[PDB]
Design a protein around this ligand. Structure first.
Ligand SMILES: Cc1nn(CCO)c2c1-c1cnc(N)c(n1)O[C@H](C)c1c(ccc(F)c1Cl)C(=O)N(C)C2
Ligand SMILES: Cc1nn(CCO)c2c1-c1cnc(N)c(n1)O[C@H](C)c1c(ccc(F)c1Cl)C(=O)N(C)C2
Lengths: 257, 272
């Protein structure tokens, strides 16, 4: 019943072209009501189905839902698991931010829309943290845009998103996700800049050990920078929870004319 | 002849003191250093070590011949070569004037951070483009192919003027359509990389072709797709960078035409 409900019948799925390369493909899923739903299919044993059953029960507007898991049985009898996800035409937030800086792309993103993106991700992360679920790969590239332009957290090495204590040890907590969130806020405020310009991935731990953090973007309100800086406090216990973060962002968005 | 090309660029190894690494790689490292001049004083230098294929003397032959050209370069918007030092298995080292302000690409990214340089106005962005176009025009006049033109390879002098550097001594998103297909290369291929460099400056350090992967580039270009106009970019400035990417290399303007188009555009703007 646990792994049975998460597994989707393979003949309900039709695969299409590659979206990105495990490989990600577009697809069609036949639903209970007779209609077909557009899906994204991520190609990846019994323990995998347990964590997939965990993600399947997540139900929050700022969190991507897992529709199910398809087992592809090869001609040589070897199984291949596939993660079935809802298809989001607008793609990832990182790419969206960069296109916004081009004339053919979306319009110049105003500060009110940049903040609502942060609020969206914070509500999603607050939801996951309450469920005691770790993201472990939070970044603008893993935040997806819904058809109504609201942001959802998804896809739950990236050295420049990893908290100082996680680089030293192998330790990962909700406060490590809070650090990655701070970096994600910086990615949105700079409209897609790669973190730490002029710093190489191999110099990152020493740079962080010496107390250097991501610098304040040029057109960033001091209040906004205070919120992202609070995410990178050396001691994880000094970093705020996603719940504190979410409200600070909502109140900052409220204060803007 | 092998010692003749050496003699014209060679600097005695004991005149050079090596310091800390400024940049590292696979095919060599860059270090800061001190070079003792003939007038007794010492000059701050950048030292580029290059691991060449020593199975034949063809790579050192190619290196020394390029260094002979590089030593005679005399233009304010072109980095001069101070000389060549040999670490002895022979290991050649390129000696360059030290530029504390670093590269243009890193400068552009820093300008977008409150603590870094102030917001670069359009006039100063265009002035950078003019400086590179003057440097590239000087190179093209001497029939010297750069082959690695990018903002990351443009250096700022102490007076904040830009100079063309590196000169491809030996990446996909800077390579002209004809150079991707066949190993073919001309000054017109350098004109393509210049248009890509103009785009980097106008976007203040964005990576070219957001959303497009390096392996998709040839196919993307062959379908007539080009770098998109930055949001705040003048149509007139975009016309200039677009002309650099015409499918046929013969349709692309020379560096001399480009330089004047950018200088005239810069003059048409207020002093503010
Ligand atoms: C239509 C499309 N174009 N592009 C490229 C431009 O963004 C993408 C999608 C897409 C749409 N819908 C999905 N559910 C989906 N992907 O899910 C992926 C598994 C996915 C990523 C990336 C980050 C991430 F969070 C996730 Cl969930 C991915 O692999 N992509 C290729 C992103
Ligand atoms: C002081 C410093 N900090 N940084 C890092 C921030 O830019 C650099 C330098 C530096 C200064 N002066 C030079 N002549 C010099 N390098 O020469 C290098 C051989 C060089 C590059 C890069 C591009 C390029 F065109 C050249 Cl000529 C390089 O390797 N760097 C590490 C750049």
């Amino acid at each position: 019943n646990k792994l049975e409900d998460v597994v989707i019948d393979r003949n309900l799925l039709i695969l299409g072209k590659i979206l990105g390369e495990g490989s990600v493909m577009e697809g069609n899923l036949k639903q209970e009501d007779g209609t077909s739903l557009k899906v994204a299919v991520k190609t990846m044993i019994e323990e995998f189905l347990s964590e997939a059953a965990c993600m399947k029960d997540f139900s929050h507007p700022n969190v991507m839902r897992l529709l199910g898991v398809c087992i592809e049985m090869s001609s040589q009898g070897i199984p291949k698991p596939m993660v079935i996800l809802p298809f989001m035409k607008y793609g990832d937030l990182h790419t969206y931010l960069l296109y916004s800086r081009l004339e053919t792309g979306p319009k110049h993103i105003p500060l009110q829309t940049l903040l609502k993106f942060m609020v969206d991700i914070a509500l999603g992360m607050e939801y996951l943290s309450n469920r005691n679920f770790l993201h472990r790969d939070l970044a603008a590239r893993n935040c997806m845009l819904r058809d109504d332009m609201t942001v959802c957290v998804a896809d739950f090495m990236p050295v420049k998103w990893i908290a100082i204590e996680s680089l030293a040890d192998r330790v990962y907590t909700s406060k490590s996700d809070v650090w990655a969130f701070g970096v994600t806020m910086w990615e949105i405020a700079t409209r897609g800049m790669t973190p730490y310009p002029g710093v190489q991935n191999h110099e990152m731990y020493d740079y962080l050990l010496h107390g250097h953090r991501l610098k304040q973007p040029e057109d960033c309100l001091d209040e906004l920078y205070e919120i992202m800086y609070s995410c990178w406090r050396t001691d994880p216990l000094d970093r705020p929870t996603f719940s504190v973060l979410r409200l600070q962002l909502e109140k900052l968005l409220e204060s803007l004319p």
